[PDB]
Amino acid sequence: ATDRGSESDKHFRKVSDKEKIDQLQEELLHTQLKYQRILERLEKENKELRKL
Amino acid sequence: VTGKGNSSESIEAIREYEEEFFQNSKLLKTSMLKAHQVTTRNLSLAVSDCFWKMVRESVEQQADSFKATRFNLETEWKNNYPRLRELDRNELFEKAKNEILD
Numbered sequence A: 001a002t003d004r005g006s007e008s009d010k011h012f013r014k015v016s017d018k019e020k021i022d023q024l025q026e027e028l029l030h031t032q033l034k035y036q037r038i039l040e041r042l043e044k045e046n047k048e049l050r051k052l
Numbered sequence B: 001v002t003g004k005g006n007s008s009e010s011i012e013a014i015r016e017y018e019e020e021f022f023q024n025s026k027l028l029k030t031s032m033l034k035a036h037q038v039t040t041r042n043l044s045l046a047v048s049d050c051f052w053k054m055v056r057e058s059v060e061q062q063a064d065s066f067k068a069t070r071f072n073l074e075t076e077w078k079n080n081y082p083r084l085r086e087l088d089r090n091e092l093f094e095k096a097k098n099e100i101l102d
Helices: A005-020 A023-031 A033-047 B012-024 B040-080 B089-101
Strands: none
Touching (some): A005 B040
């Protein structure tokens, strides 16, 4: 374990995953994703040629 | 919406003031204040709803730091104290007591 890259990689991966589920990404789940339905509806409006 | 009143005045004195101050004063006669700002129930509700919203939004991610702290403590143990357990005020005392008696 001492002076072994594998332990550093495991620690980095665990910390990275904890950061990935941290508050930085938690907020986006409640501020961005819930409007993807409106984005999809706007995409449907854009693809329709009525406006053009 | 309160007046000097006294310590014995009930909550309904707040409703009475919500009527008298704002129907009598410039706060509505000159539209300085909006009706929803007159109501203190609107302060209570604005605080409560956004409070629980903040709860649901942010409290969950406190688990990341809890897990990080547990990981760090257990890491120090595994590296240096593999025999270390929840050796709180009771367990260490009991072990020392038994060693002393022996």
